[PDB]
Ligand binder design. Sequence first.
Ligand SMILES: Nc1nc2c(ncn2[C@@H]2O[C@H](COP(=O)(O)OP(=O)(O)NP(=O)(O)O)[C@@H](O)[C@H]2O)c(=O)[nH]1
Ligand SMILES: Nc1nc2c(ncn2[C@@H]2O[C@H](COP(=O)(O)OP(=O)(O)NP(=O)(O)O)[C@@H](O)[C@H]2O)c(=O)[nH]1
Ligand SMILES: Nc1nc2c(ncn2[C@@H]2O[C@H](COP(=O)(O)OP(=O)(O)NP(=O)(O)O)[C@@H](O)[C@H]2O)c(=O)[nH]1
Ligand SMILES: Nc1nc2c(ncn2[C@@H]2O[C@H](COP(=O)(O)OP(=O)(O)O)[C@@H](O)[C@H]2O)c(=O)[nH]1
Ligand SMILES: Nc1nc2c(ncn2[C@@H]2O[C@H](COP(=O)(O)OP(=O)(O)O)[C@@H](O)[C@H]2O)c(=O)[nH]1
Ligand SMILES: [Mg+2]
Ligand SMILES: [Mg+2]
Ligand SMILES: [Mg+2]
Lengths: 290, 290, 284, 290, 285, 336
Amino acid sequence: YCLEDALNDLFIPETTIETILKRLTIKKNIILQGPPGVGKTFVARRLAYLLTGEKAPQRVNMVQFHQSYSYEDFIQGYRPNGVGFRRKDGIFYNFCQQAKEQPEKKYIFIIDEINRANLSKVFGEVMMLMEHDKRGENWSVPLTYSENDEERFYVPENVYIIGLMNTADRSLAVVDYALRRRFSFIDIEPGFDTPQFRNFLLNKKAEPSFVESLCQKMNELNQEISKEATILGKGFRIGHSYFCCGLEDGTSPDTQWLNEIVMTDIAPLLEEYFFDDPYKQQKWTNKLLG
Amino acid sequence: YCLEDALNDLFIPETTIETILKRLTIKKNIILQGPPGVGKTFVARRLAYLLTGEKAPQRVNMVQFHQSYSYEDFIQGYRPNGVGFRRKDGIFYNFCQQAKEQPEKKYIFIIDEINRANLSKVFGEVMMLMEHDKRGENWSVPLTYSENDEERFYVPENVYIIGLMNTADRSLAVVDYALRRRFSFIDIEPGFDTPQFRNFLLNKKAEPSFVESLCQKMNELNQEISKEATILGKGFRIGHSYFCCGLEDGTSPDTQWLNEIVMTDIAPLLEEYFFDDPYKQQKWTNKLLG
Amino acid sequence: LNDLFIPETTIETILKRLTIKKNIILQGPPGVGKTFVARRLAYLLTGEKAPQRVNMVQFHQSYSYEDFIQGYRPNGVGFRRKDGIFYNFCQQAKEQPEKKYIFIIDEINRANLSKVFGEVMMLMEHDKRGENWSVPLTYSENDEERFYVPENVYIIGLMNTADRSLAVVDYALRRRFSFIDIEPGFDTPQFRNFLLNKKAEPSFVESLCQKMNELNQEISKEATILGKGFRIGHSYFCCGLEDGTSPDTQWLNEIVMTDIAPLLEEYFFDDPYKQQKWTNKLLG
Amino acid sequence: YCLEDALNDLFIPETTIETILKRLTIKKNIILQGPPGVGKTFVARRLAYLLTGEKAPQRVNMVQFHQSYSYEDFIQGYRPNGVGFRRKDGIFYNFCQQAKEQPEKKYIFIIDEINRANLSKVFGEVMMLMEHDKRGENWSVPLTYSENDEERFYVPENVYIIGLMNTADRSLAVVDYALRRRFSFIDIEPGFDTPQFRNFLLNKKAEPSFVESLCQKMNELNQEISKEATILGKGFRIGHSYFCCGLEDGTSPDTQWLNEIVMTDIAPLLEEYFFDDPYKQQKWTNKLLG
Amino acid sequence: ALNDLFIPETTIETILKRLTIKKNIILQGPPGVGKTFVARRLAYLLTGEKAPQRVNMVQFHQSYSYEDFIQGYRPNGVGFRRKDGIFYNFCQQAKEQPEKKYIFIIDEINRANLSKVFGEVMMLMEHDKRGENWSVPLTYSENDEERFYVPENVYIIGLMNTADRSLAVVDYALRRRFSFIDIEPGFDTPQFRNFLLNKKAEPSFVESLCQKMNELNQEISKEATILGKGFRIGHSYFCCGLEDGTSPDTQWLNEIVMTDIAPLLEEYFFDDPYKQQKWTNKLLG
Amino acid sequence: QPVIPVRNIYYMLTYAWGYANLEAIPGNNLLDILGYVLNKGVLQLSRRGLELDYNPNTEIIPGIKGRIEFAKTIRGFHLNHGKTVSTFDMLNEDTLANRIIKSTLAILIKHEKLNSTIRDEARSLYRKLPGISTLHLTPQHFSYLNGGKNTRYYKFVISVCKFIVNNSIPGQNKGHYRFYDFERNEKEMSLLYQKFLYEFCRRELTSANTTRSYLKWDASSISDQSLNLLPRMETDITIRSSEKILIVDAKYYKSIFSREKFHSQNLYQLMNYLWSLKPENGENIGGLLIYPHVDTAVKHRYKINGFDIGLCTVNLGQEWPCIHQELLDIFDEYLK
Ligand SMILES: Nc1nc2c(ncn2[C@@H]2O[C@H](COP(=O)(O)OP(=O)(O)NP(=O)(O)O)[C@@H](O)[C@H]2O)c(=O)[nH]1
Ligand SMILES: Nc1nc2c(ncn2[C@@H]2O[C@H](COP(=O)(O)OP(=O)(O)NP(=O)(O)O)[C@@H](O)[C@H]2O)c(=O)[nH]1
Ligand SMILES: Nc1nc2c(ncn2[C@@H]2O[C@H](COP(=O)(O)OP(=O)(O)NP(=O)(O)O)[C@@H](O)[C@H]2O)c(=O)[nH]1
Ligand SMILES: Nc1nc2c(ncn2[C@@H]2O[C@H](COP(=O)(O)OP(=O)(O)O)[C@@H](O)[C@H]2O)c(=O)[nH]1
Ligand SMILES: Nc1nc2c(ncn2[C@@H]2O[C@H](COP(=O)(O)OP(=O)(O)O)[C@@H](O)[C@H]2O)c(=O)[nH]1
Ligand SMILES: [Mg+2]
Ligand SMILES: [Mg+2]
Ligand SMILES: [Mg+2]
């Protein structure tokens, strides 16, 4: 496996893709922040195979934080056995043991919607330990529910952590600045202007005018979205996922199909987005339609 | 089962219905939004047997969410058998296993008043999984309470999801735009000015003159409701159900019958819609009677 | 049908509305006999004075879905799933389909009504009653085990209109419930006949109605602040004269200070003179 | 354990560490109060070995506090057997007993992220003993979980307690009452305008002007943050460790290396800081690149 | 006892008129009014037998709950048992004796949430719904063999205090079922004046103090919002220390000014020490 | 000692906050105006329904609710007395956003100088929110609310509470409040003036693009590249269009209200902004000084140093639409 394999279908420029690996290899923990529908989930499984250099799932682990995950779930907690409780090693603790089984091959842990959960609660002791410098046996620390006999948990160097925080929900945004120092934050743009997106449509039986018209209108809209910061900030700007899918059957892209998209998905979003004047809603919808 | 069985009593146009099944076959997640009393609950049981094409309720699961509902109830959680606690596979988890047994047949899960409960907390792990392109074992994920990483949950492809949310309360709305992306939102309207609504009345010995007077009146009133979107959106407008039920005995819909219900139901509703304006209450109420 | 102070037409509306619609909200100020009305009325619908069929509860903010329908709660040995009253009650009525079983909910406004009802907020409607409309419950161990409202069940809601909470408005529940206002009924003869058959003076009864109406009308003057829902009920007068003390001006004077005076403070808060004025108006 | 190994690399002035060493022998309960990335965790591991004069793990203990951390794990409590509950000596109890053996040798206990958990919930009764004056067997007390009054615990004088607290969160504005009486707060500067931080870069093949140019802006920026009190206090200002890391290869510092840090770490942080004025983000981000 | 009580007899007579009929009652008044001591003598008065066994007293707090009040499960040596609470035990004691009036004292009732505590029973204590007809099975009553009903004999008294400005409007639950009563400090009353003149107090010393406190009681209630009528000082501080064996004197009062009224005076205003000092100095002489 | 009529100022605040009938209210003073909207605004919200945020609750209860935390239960041995430590998400209105409104209503009622009707109606609403907890308001509370998760409507009414809280002064009584004499201070009035225009220009001048531009000196100094000592320069507004660029410097002065000598020191700032700014398009460069006057509006144009500069005024107190007319009329002249 190689970059050529991954970047065949991805709409992202190579520019970020190398920047991603650059920050990762030095820092070992990063976050990709972007609105939904920009392939955040999409890239993540592909990224994992690059660094290992092979398409292996075993060295990779994927999860989602749902605002109910806990340290007891992630790391160490007490679970009922048949009649009485027992201590259960969590998944991350289970994962790190696998990673240190062989240090040579890199191990990746993938967390969707990380911003939801209270990360300080879940990770706890690990929030220090995850950082690149403070890894290995030198910085071994004993866990909360560890046995009285000294047993310590240390992050292996090979481990890499990836976080996936959407930029829509403002409330669910990272205000743990202590935690935000462990991570490096990579903004991802919608991907409209890129040719690699455009080629994907043109290869799929599309007119260059209709394609080039589409990107022109969306880019106008996201500027207007980007214009405001009071309610609708830059991050809210629309993703490209809507347009990506649904053409597998052979349906060529046209105003009929585009019209179905606008009425069905975007038009609800807009009225939900603005909720001040329909004219703005009527304006931009008709602009896309016309 | 057959399509025409449902459409006989249905006031909504087929055009909307055809739009609906087209999306649902594609998206596998949908949300139906309208005021109360427009048959969201009514259509949904009908619609499932259409999509399957056969009237199998065992393949259908119907639930109403509310505040006292969680991931522990829905998906997985530890609950008391008795002296000893056990891991209890939630209802949705059980439903998904059933669909796996028969991959060919479509299995449908119906959520009434979805917008009430905190979907962000309830779906969680599912919030990523449910999307149309991410279903299958390739995207299998271990849960919070899974014993090990190997125990993983993947949504079957056959499953279709239905979301039912009233538009009366802006308080309870799906503001999570990420959650909005998974669901395809199809508005439903009261549909007074429809033949099938009128045919139902005339079939029950109703005056065509009274009917045309009736539909025109509400159409104007509902349009008045949609006007003040700042105050009350189009989603607030009155449904057709108030007039629908109550004639089962065979009572003819005279003007007196309508005058009785208006006083009993819509009148206090009108009072609430116009807290500040008594004349506006008096205006429209008196408008109906003459 | 004899001692009721509410119009005969109003009760006739209710029985027709109730049997058809199966759900109602009876909203009015305190002291209008909401409890006695429904309890009197409930025996009419059954046709027999059966209290076992009838069950009443008074909701409160802490009341929860745990209490009403289902919930996990402790036995002596440990925790188990405990069927709340309504699940217990509906099963009892389901046992006997023919007879009409009733469920009464007082001070309904206090609780988050959506929260309490939960699943049945859909099921309670008359059409969606039966095995077809059954659903597995939130805490149901198995998907196959479901709960459905029987047709015989009829539901009554009693609402105090003087404590509006600008927290939650549900217009969907309003679709389930047919709202019926209740006036105090001072003008009604049945209220007057009760007192004149209790050795009241003819003028004394007539004087009271004039006194109360002038006050009640002022309450409904400013619909924004207060309404007809706020105005005073009559029931305070019913109690306390069956000992054998017939009405007198002194007895009136007691109730004004005893009961109504805090209400005035509650209503006409930070305006003592209006309280003193309206208080003194009645005494004269 | 020579100071030269300890103090040469450090960016902090030798004055403040000496001042820290004074109070630490004096009071033995100390808190380092500064934003993340200034080496609070970094110094403390060295500081313990300074006082002892040796690199000894046994005499020095490190922990990070979080919400799950509690008295029963920290001090003493009951852990389930298969059914039964067994008492277990907690860390601090086990840790002090080592210190009881060797009164002359200094013992060190390091608590990072202390504010996250309430001290009373964890420490509780022992806060009486923990204070510097009321130490030694004279003040011995029987524990909450002691089987009998005979068994008693007293904090020996030799142990010193270190607390690492970050002034990066809004909740910490209302500092806990438990801490203030018993601990001595010390502020850690960002330490940009220091010789050793500069000299660290100069040894790593850095131009002086590019180094000196950077510090004024960083010194300028942190000054702007500290001027605010409502949203961002002085304690929120940037630390000096973003720039430290990432040079392990030997790659020379330059605008290329620096620009990576700005966009990937500091740029989105500023969005969180200057949400209200996005243009203010543009002001600084453009300023730093220039 | 009436002569020993300092409050107007009309209020004493009025209360017995209300409670007998209403069966639920709450007293709101200043601290230092002998509200507890008031009710006990009144409790003995209504029963007529001066029986403490019939009488049971409870003081509420924010933690107080249904398990404390009514019923709950408490640990055994092994396992756990259903454990009868106070009110469950108390009424069943009263159930045997229907004729005999039984009284319940709830101190500092406003602090706790009545609903959370009472729960189901909160309606059953309403006088209209009493006896076996309104019987309900309890939350923890696993079987339907026994249902809990408050019999008619029960009377419930609640002691609330108007001391605190932090207190917001009373809970709606309370207002419905209870008749709210304001108790005067009773300085003006002769029965309190005869409680000092019986101790060989000077009539000038007696009368002056009545005027002195009244001057304050007007000023403390003169404040519109922050300090109302309910705030004004009660007499209980004056009782304790005179009939123990030490005669009244201005110096005895002088200590009392510093002891209770002076900090209380600081507490009410909490703004102006001079306004406190002016009043404290005014009290002393 | 003249100032603008108080009603019109509210319109300027609205544009300043970026988002009704004031003819009905008879109270000339500001606080009658502001409270009436707040008192009415909450009523508008309550009609639709107030915000309810899922608040997690972890407590000791007699049963299973939501998710039981096994650890806290066993450590506390709550099983023995039939209790569990369980987490669940009760849905309340007691959030910070709602708490701010309610505590503010106490301040509004407590204000010494206020219309009787406004005080009475608010006291009703204060009672109408029993569940919510009163709080002691600070900007730090408002600071936390910069997330703005609530609706656009909430964010408007919240901004009102910010104005009241900061512009509330205790008066005769220790408890009660007294409103700030906002009009008298020029500085906040100027910041009102500048902020009013910037958001206003985005609304009406859709034709042009409106952005604030930071400027950098043309200077080079051997001593420091930083030039920290030099004054920081940030435009009040720049309103760029294809045909012409235009910078405006506007400030609120008391002297100009008098119809004599003229106070135009801000012009000194303006010229150097023109110099340090260099346009790539090079279409033209124009400047404008606009001030508030009471009586009448006067416009002049000047050609000073190769720059086209305008001095203009507005007759505030006339009428808001005609004022709205006048401002758009003004820019049309210069934007050319
Ligand atoms: N073929 C192709 N599909 C893409 C590309 N980028 C995004 N998509 C598609 O857009 C859809 C959603 O992508 P996803 O990764 O889940 O976006 P997300 O940010 O993770 N979603 P969310 O923020 O809601 O969690 C998928 O169909 C995904 O394949 C791309 O570059 N190529
Ligand atoms: N006979 C008949 N009844 C209909 C039709 N459409 C809606 N109704 C009736 O209207 C009532 C409510 O249906 P429902 O789906 O619950 O409306 P809703 O939008 O879901 N209401 P809510 O959202 O509040 O739950 C029922 O009486 C239903 O049968 C229809 O086409 N034919
Ligand atoms: N060489 C050198 N590195 C330093 C210096 N100060 C901090 N660092 C580096 O900064 C990184 C993090 O330091 P750290 O102590 O963890 O900061 P912190 O205060 O603990 N972070 P937090 O407050 O979030 O817990 C490490 O690489 C550390 O060595 C210093 O003075 N010299
Ligand atoms: N005879 C008669 N008694 C009534 C009437 N209305 C109420 N009462 C009595 O008033 C007493 C209290 O009624 P209650 O239900 O508590 O008042 P509400 O709940 O606020 O409406 C009971 O004795 C009622 O029966 C009535 O219309 N006629
Ligand atoms: N003898 C007598 N003592 C009274 C009277 N009123 C109050 N007291 C005394 O005042 C004390 C009780 O006061 P109280 O307010 O209940 O104390 P609190 O509950 O802490 O506020 C006891 O000494 C009572 O006997 C009274 O009228 N006569
Ligand atoms: Mg995704
Ligand atoms: Mg429905
Ligand atoms: Mg650290």
